[PDB]
């Protein structure tokens, strides 16, 4: 299913915006506008590819399955397994 | 019975203790039964 997935992933906290990304970056979906979603998700994809390289450095068998950065202004979410790259815009708290 | 010094009191005590020995022989039968039903294995230790 699609709509139920986003609806449940969103209303759990009244999340500002999430779109489903099953491809490597460049998502055409949108939740609040096309740019702030697409370009930011592409930047996230580029960053997490490097992060995956980083985790593979210490041992190549390692892979990143879960990633969160909680900063003073935003909390960014992504849980990659093979192509499933999450995006979450949410308050730091 | 206790400090009771009536010899017939000793006799009543003897009846009480022969009843005691009746329970005791019930115990003897039980322990001998467990003996024999646990026997037949060999001589060593926990066998005989």
């Amino acid at each position: 299913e699609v709509e139920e997935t986003l609806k449940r992933l969103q209303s759990q906290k009244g999340v500002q915006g999430i779109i489903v990304v099953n491809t490597e970056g460049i998502p055409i979906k949108s939740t609040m506008d096309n740019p702030t979603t697409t370009q930011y998700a592409s930047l996230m994809h580029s960053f997490i590819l490097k992060a995956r390289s980083t985790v593979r450095d210490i041992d190549p068998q390692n892979d990143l399955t879960f990633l969160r950065i909680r900063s003073k202004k935003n909390e960014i979410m992504v849980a990659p397994d093979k192509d499933y790259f999450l995006i979450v815009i949410q308050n730091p708290t | 019975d206790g400090l009771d010094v009536s010899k017939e009191g000793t006799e009543a005590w003897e009846a009480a203790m022969k009843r005691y020995d009746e329970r005791i022989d019930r115990v003897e039968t039980r322990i001998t039964a467990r003996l024999r039903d646990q026997l037949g294995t060999a001589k060593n230790a926990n066998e005989m």
Binding site: F66 | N44, A45, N46
Partner: protein, 394 residues
């Protein structure tokens, strides 16, 4: 840049922000959640080096609990074939061959791992020479060899063990004639200390087993070939035999001090394995054998305390049965007892330092690695008190 300015900047007092940062991140990162019986464990039996050639001694490496030294002694099939062979067998991965093979000129009669050198195996042979084996070298020949002089051992040495701290070691060895000698692990050219064990004046001891109590290195217990166990002091004014024990009417074939710690001490206890199926739970402080487990027609060959359970101990037999005696659980029947197939006379037992698994020797060379039930291996905290009470029983 270099490692000096960092020290001063650490000594600088701008770290309140950093300290608050660390406090916050640690206290926030504190919460954690998740994202979502006796058994034949293994076999070890060479064929090239283990045709007949009965087992003689076993040991586990303290530094590498996955390694086991074997020592296959008798050569009777082919005089041309190697006389004495020592095998080291690994535990992490299963292979049909020993990880390394060592051949000594004579017949190796005992062996063990060195503590200081984690890459070295030292064994005593039948000739009387203490023999090294450096696993770095690619030469199967012994690396360093003690001389067969009057100063060193000249009789079949059956007991070798290196003890002490990593910075204070002494390879002790005592031979059948009874001459104790300590060597430096790195220098075996000369016996750094030796002394001939003697009982009451003019009475040598036909020594055939030893065991150092856990921790102590100065006093120990020795088991003679004459059935009478003794306690000796390794170093001191009373250096030598200090006790005469009635023991058993058969030659001692094994000895071992206690192998557990954590609660009320039991190191004064030690079990001996005699030559008439009479293992003797028994202590140094007393003089009478505390108890005399007996059964069987055959007779034991080795006995070892469990490294973790302060009651359990193994017991070999000539009919091939290995039985674990858990004293607290019971004192009359083997708590566990199974016979290896083919009823061969097992000859050695060596518990893994972990205590979770047991080895056994063999009369044909097939070392069997037995595993044990969890409930039968790990003792409880109450177990020590129960052991104390059982000993207090008599």
């Amino acid at each position: 840049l270099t490692e000096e300015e960092k020290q001063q900047i650490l000594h600088s007092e701008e770290f309140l922000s950093f300290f608050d940062h660390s406090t916050r991140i640690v206290e926030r990162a504190l919460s954690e959640q998740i994202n979502i019986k006796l058994s034949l464990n293994r076999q070890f039996f060479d064929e090239r080096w283990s045709k007949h050639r009965v087992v003689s001694c076993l040991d586990w490496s303290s530094q590498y609990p996955e390694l086991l030294v074997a020592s296959y002694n008798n050569n009777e099939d082919a005089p041309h074939e190697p006389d004495g062979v020592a095998l080291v067998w690994n535990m992490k991965y299963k292979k049909t061959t020993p990880e390394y093979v060592f051949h000594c000129q004579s017949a190796v009669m005992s062996a063990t791992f060195a503590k200081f050198h984690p890459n070295l195996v030292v064994g005593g042979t039948y000739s009387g020479q203490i023999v090294l084996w450096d696993n770095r070298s690619n030469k199967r020949t012994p690396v360093q060899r003690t001389p067969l002089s009057a100063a060193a051992h000249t009789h079949p040495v059956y007991c070798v063990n290196v003890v002490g701290t990593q910075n204070a070691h002494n390879l002790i060895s005592i031979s059948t004639d009874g001459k104790i000698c300590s060597w430096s692990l790195d220098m075996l050219s000369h016996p750094q200390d030796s002394m001939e064990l003697v009982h009451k004046q003019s009475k040598a001891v036909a020594v055939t087993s030893m065991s150092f109590p856990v921790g102590d290195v100065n006093n120990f217990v020795v088991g003679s070939e004459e059935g009478s166990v003794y306690t000796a002091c390794r170093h001191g004014s009373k250096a030598g035999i200090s006790e005469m024990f009635e023991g058993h009417q058969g030659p001692i074939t094994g000895i071992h001090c206690h192998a557990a710690v954590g609660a009320v001490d039991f190191s004064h206890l030690f079990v001996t394995s005699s030559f008439d199926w009479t293992v003797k739970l028994w202590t140094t402080k007393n003089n009478k054998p505390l108890y005399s487990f007996e059964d069987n027609a055959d007779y034991v060959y080795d006995v070892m305390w469990s490294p973790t359970h302060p009651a359990l101990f193994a017991c070999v037999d000539g009919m091939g049965r290995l039985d674990l005696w858990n004293l607290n659980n019971d004192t009359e029947v083997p708590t566990a007892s199974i016979s290896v197939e083919g009823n061969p006379a097992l000859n050695r037992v060596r518990w893994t330092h972990s205590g979770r698994e047991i080895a056994v020797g063999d009369s044909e060379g097939q070392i069997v690695i037995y595993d044990v039930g969890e409930q039968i291996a790990v003792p409880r905290n109450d177990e020590w008190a129960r052991f104390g009470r059982t000993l207090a029983e008599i």
